[PDB]
Amino acid sequence: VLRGTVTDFPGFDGRADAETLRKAMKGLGTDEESILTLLTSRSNAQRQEISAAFKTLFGRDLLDDLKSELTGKFEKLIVALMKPSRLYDAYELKHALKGAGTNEKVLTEIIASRTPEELRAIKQVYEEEYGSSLEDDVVGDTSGYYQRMLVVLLQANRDPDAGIDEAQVEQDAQALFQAGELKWGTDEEKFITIFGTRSVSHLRKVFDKYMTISGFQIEETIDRETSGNLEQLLLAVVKSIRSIPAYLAETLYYAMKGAGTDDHTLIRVMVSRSEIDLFNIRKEFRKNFATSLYSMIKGDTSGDYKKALLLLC
Ligand SMILES: [Ca+2]
Numbered sequence: 588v589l590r591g592t593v594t595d596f597p598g599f600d601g602r603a604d605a606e607t608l609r610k611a612m613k614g615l616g617t618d619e620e621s622i623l624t625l626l627t628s629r630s631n632a633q634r635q636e637i638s639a640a641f642k643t644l645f646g647r648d649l650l651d652d653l654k655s656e657l658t659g660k661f662e663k664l665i666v667a668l669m670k671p672s673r674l675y676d677a678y679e680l681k682h683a684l685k686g687a688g689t690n691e692k693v694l695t696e697i698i699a700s701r702t703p704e705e706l707r708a709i710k711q712v713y714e715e716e717y718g719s720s721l722e723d724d725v726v727g728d729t730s731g732y733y734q735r736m737l738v739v740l741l742q743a744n745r746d747p748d749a750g751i752d753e754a755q756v757e758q759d760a761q762a763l764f765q766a767g768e769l770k771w772g773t774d775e776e777k778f779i780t781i782f783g784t785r786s787v788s789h790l791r792k793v794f795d796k797y798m799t800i801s802g803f804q805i806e807e808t809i810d811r812e813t814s815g816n817l818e819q820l821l822l823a824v825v826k827s828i829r830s831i832p833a834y835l836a837e838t839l840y841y842a843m844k845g846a847g848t849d850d851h852t853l854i855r856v857m858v859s860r861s862e863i864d865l866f867n868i869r870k871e872f873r874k875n876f877a878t879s880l881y882s883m884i885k886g887d888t889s890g891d892y893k894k895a896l897l898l899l900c
Pocket residue numbers: 611612613614615616617656
């Protein structure tokens with residue numbers, strides 16, 4: 588069952604909260620600790636009510652005020668909290684597509700881990716907000732089978748979980764076996780349909796059967812955690828069919844491991860999942876990585892940015 592770490596604050600008063608925030612901002616400087624503790628303990632819907640209340644009481648726009656007063660990764664994190672939950676994934680998608688080049692990592696990550704229902708809603712908001720079709724901007728920025736696989740997934744049309752046709756489980760585990768042995772370089776079209784179109788429970792049975800045929804897990808054969816956009820996507824889909832919290836816990840782990848931090852991914856997964864499954868991601872993190880998410884964040888981040896992330900966690 589999915590559990591998030593941010594819920595609605597009981598006893599919420601949008602007006603009183605807008606006043607605290609005004610007082611924190613107003614005058615020389617800023618009180619970041621006041622902003623930080625309030626906005627991490629109100630849900631996203633309550634933050635939208637605070638923005639509305641701030642504007643009725645003061646005629647000032649709350650988010651421009653926050654962008655004025657805050658700086659750096661803390662500012663980026665607060666701005667991300669303030670994005671309406673329904674617009675945020677579409678916002679991240681638009682910013683990976685836009686401009687020169689493209690950030691394929693955010694593309695793989697959101698399209699492979701969002702459910703068909705989330706994707707239909709995202710496609711809708713993206714159009715409404717940006718005028719173009721998510722699909723046309725994706726096609727405009729990606730090439731090859733990576734492009735094809737993304738479009739397949741963007742159709743939000745996986746089969747229903749019902750007819751476990753074990754003959755087609757058999758059949759599909761064979762195709763993937765043969766494809767794995769050829770390093771996913773030969774019959775792309777066959778396996779893009781299997782990974783994009785089958786039901787989640789069919790593909791779980793297919794992944795079990797693959798292992799019984801080969802002796803190893805299917806991600807062993809696709810395991811190049813770098814280099815090759817299609818392979819990175821195949822890996823994100825296999826991982827998300829098994830468990831979307833486990834896959835998102837893993838991208839968090841790799842955002843902090845080594846020199847530096849991928850603060851954009853750390854902010855994106857912490858914020859986008861705070862009210863969906865961040866608790867499940869936490870449990871998966873500890874289980875698969877033998878460290879709690881809190882402790883890795885704490886050693887990897889500093890200042891008010893750290894304080895706010897630890898309160899979200
Ligand atoms: Ca000020």
